Amino acid sequence: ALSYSSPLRFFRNFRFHPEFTRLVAGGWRSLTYSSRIDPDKEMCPYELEGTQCPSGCSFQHFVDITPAADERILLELSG
Amino acid sequence: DEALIKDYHSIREQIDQYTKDMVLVMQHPTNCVKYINPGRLMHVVTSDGTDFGWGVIINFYERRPERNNPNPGWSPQESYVVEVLLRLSSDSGSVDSKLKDNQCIPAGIAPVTQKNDPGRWEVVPCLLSCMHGLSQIKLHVPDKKSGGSMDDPETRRRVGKSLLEVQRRFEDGIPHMDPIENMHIRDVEFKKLLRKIEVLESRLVANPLHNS
Ligand SMILES: [Zn+2]
């Protein structure tokens, strides 16, 4: 059946699409639609190289922009 | 049901028209030079449609016409050049660094098109007319007084390969800058443009052909 990709699919409001879960593999937890990217910070060059950041490294890291994992959060809440 | 086919494609035509109107606004210099920042990612696509993928913005300068051609009739989107690091095919030739009055990208280059082609990371000049995305993502790139430079091919392959690490990590795609929330494009016409596209999309799915 006939298919078509919205020119608005990369913009923030695409998250309010009713089929959003269906067309983006990651769903709300997909990094592609994360609300946590600071557009003026630089991603860590050490992280991308795969080498260990120095202590206190203040580049933007992937952990900064990745949503919390509900398994860790359901964990913390108990006890 | 031929009346209903004609409606479906009428909608698609209207959405295509409004889509090029929208792209023009976001490519316009007064709306995007603020965000043409060294290290920000940029999706480069030629007017004819060859897709060079994502690259790293290195520099951007105002375009200057040739001596013999004072008024070259450039549009606003053809009046600025962004120097972008792109992954070219090893097949692709030498990167001439200045564009002629009639070119949007250099003449002898092409994107990577074969597997077991690693590519070659080169800095390529592009008109704003070839910008089809700005990312929220910024890589770190050397600058004046940082002691590095993108003239070193080895630095280009170092930065280049991190951009492929970013794309590997972004399974669902590199995240775009939002024209409203990130670029704060105030134009009332642009505001209406995005709503016009949405209501037309609602019209288009209402049509049997969508799932036929
Ligand atoms: Zn780091």
Residue numbers in the entry:
A (entry chain B): 1014 to 1092
B (entry chain A): 654 to 865
What does the paper say about this structure?
Cryptic unstable transcripts (CUTs) are rapidly degraded by the nuclear exosome in a process requiring the RNA helicase Mtr4 and specific adaptor complexes for RNA substrate recognition. The eleven-subunit MTREC comprises the zinc-finger protein Red1 and the Mtr4 homologue Mtl1. The zinc-finger protein Red1 serves as the main scaffold for the entire MTREC complex, assembling the individual submodules, including the Mtl1 helicase, into a large complex. Therefore, Red1 essentially acts as an adaptor between Mtl1 and the various MTREC submodules to provide a route for RNA substrates to the exosome through the unwinding activity of Mtl1.
Therefore, we switched to the Chaetomium thermophilum (ct) Mtr4–Red1 complex (homologues of spMtl1/spMtr4 and spRed1) due to superior biochemical properties of proteins and complexes from this thermophilic eukaryote. With these data at hand, we also succeeded in determining the structure of a complex comprising co-expressed (but not fused; split chain complex) ctMtr4SA and ctRed1pep, albeit at a lower resolution of 2.75 Å. Comparison of this structure with the single-chain structure revealed only small differences, as indicated by the low RMSD of 1.08 Å for Cα atoms of 273 residues, thus validating the single-chain structure. Notably, in our structure Red1 binds to both the KOW domain and stalk helices of the helicase. Importantly, in contrast to all previously characterized, canonical ligands Red1 utilizes a large interface that extends to the stalk helices and fixes them with respect to the KOW domain by inserting a U-shaped element that serves like a wedge. This extended binding interface observed for Red1 is supported by an extensive network of hydrophobic interactions and hydrogen bonds. However, replacing Ile1050 by an arginine (I1050R) completely abolished the interaction. Overall, the interaction of Mtr4 with Red1 described in our study shields the canonical adaptor protein-binding site, and suggests a mutually exclusive interaction of hMTR4 with either ZFC3H1 (the human Red1 homologue) or AIM-like motif containing adaptor proteins.
